[PDB]
Amino acid sequence: DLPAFWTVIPAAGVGSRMRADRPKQYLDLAGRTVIERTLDCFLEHPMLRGLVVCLAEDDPYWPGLDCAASRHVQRAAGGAERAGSVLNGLLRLLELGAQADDWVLVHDAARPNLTRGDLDRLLEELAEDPVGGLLAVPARDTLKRSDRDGRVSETIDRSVVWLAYTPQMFRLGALHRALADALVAGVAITDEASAMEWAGYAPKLVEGRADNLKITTPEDLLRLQRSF
Amino acid sequence: DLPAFWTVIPAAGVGSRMRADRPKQYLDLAGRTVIERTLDCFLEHPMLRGLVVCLAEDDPYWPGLDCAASRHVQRAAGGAERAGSVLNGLLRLLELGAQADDWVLVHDAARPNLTRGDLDRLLEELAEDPVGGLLAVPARDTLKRSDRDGRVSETIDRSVVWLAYTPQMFRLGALHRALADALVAGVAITDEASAMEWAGYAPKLVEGRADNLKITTPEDLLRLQRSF
Ligand SMILES: [K+]
Ligand SMILES: [K+]
What we know:
Chains A, B: The record marks 158, 214 as: Positions MEP for the nucleophilic attack. Chains A, B: Its EC number is 2.7.7.60. Chains A, B: Belongs to the IspD/TarI cytidylyltransferase family. IspD subfamily. Chains A, B: One of its GO terms (biological process) is isopentenyl diphosphate biosynthetic process, methylerythritol 4-phosphate pathway. The structure is a homodimer. By secondary structure, the first copy, chain A, is of the alpha/beta class. The longest helix of chain A is centred in the middle third of the chain and has 14 residues, at 82-95. Helix content of chain A is 25%, strand content 25%. In chain A, β8 (143-146) and β9 (152-155) form a beta hairpin. The first copy, chain A, has a seven-stranded mixed β-sheet with strand order 5-4-1-6-10-7-11. Chain A has a two-stranded antiparallel sheet with strand order 2-3. A two-stranded antiparallel ribbon of chain A has the order 8-9. Chains A and B meet through β8, β9, β10, α5 and α6 of A and β8, β9, β10, α5 and α6 of B. One potassium ion is lined by residues 10-13, 54, 78, 82, 85 of chain A.
């Protein structure tokens, strides 16, 4: 029995202007936008309590998508960076009736190839975890550490090294506290796990598929064009 | 003035049989095989002394390629693993007149998108280096170290972490000694740098392009289909 969960998709920091080199979340992926496909990975999950997309209030692409006119997609205002956008997302979840002990999944807007199997794996492996955790994949490339002069100082043992993916799954109140405090503290937050780790907690790694990739170059798009 | 150099392409470990899921080096990349495109990255370099491809003696795909009937492409027998194939490559270079102090570049058969700019950068930055070195790219993904129970123990500082690419450039005699000794010693050799590092030496990292990617899934092929 998978746990109930909320989803937050931080998708803000889009200009007010359309640009010829579009934001990655609005690139075409086999006939639909990246972000539309990302939302498809969650919207029909039977345990989804609600999904919030964090958007610039003047985002010019969003109002043209059918997910902008969906009762199943709620909206929160973007922040100054990902953490503030996620924080606004959590406040929105509380308006929708979320409780402090509810699971929240935060997922990259530009990871449209999340499979139901990986989603369910994350939910089931963390449902009783003390902290939560994240999808991650084993590092397969050879990893070298550089010394001060740009020479190899060691080859890192990559059998203990994992690439951090999303979703990342944490309880609402705990994540809110960690993100808010880390911002005040001046921490260089990357993902939600980085805030939880700064707060002292050790997230659990859950192995996912390597092809749950993030679109960071319009060229990454090519890798996924046959995935749907 | 770029240094003179030999090239070794380890390309062995191909079965005697053709297979429906071809060896990656014989996949089609925009109308030519991967390995043909890889060879194109070296063959017309004015400082190339000679190029050796290490192949299974019964490789069924190679004899159908025009590079199998080229005076500019020499051949060496594959070994039991990459290091032994490279060692056979070095012996072939010596037959072609290579000297122990000549630079040798070893490059992955399935990295067909090496640019002349990266090749020249490697050659010029290492021409006077005491050891040699390798192309490499900064790690961009968030890297987590796992503890014994699969929880995050730390987020690795990735600003000192590099992904090892090829070519890797070392002097012939030194590389021969390192590879041969590392095999006898039972070292888990990955690339040439791993053998040189086992022998004590610190290769120099030379920054290359991230899209000099290795084709490891027929899906990686999609990323490069518009690169030529
Ligand atoms: K955001
Ligand atoms: K080989």
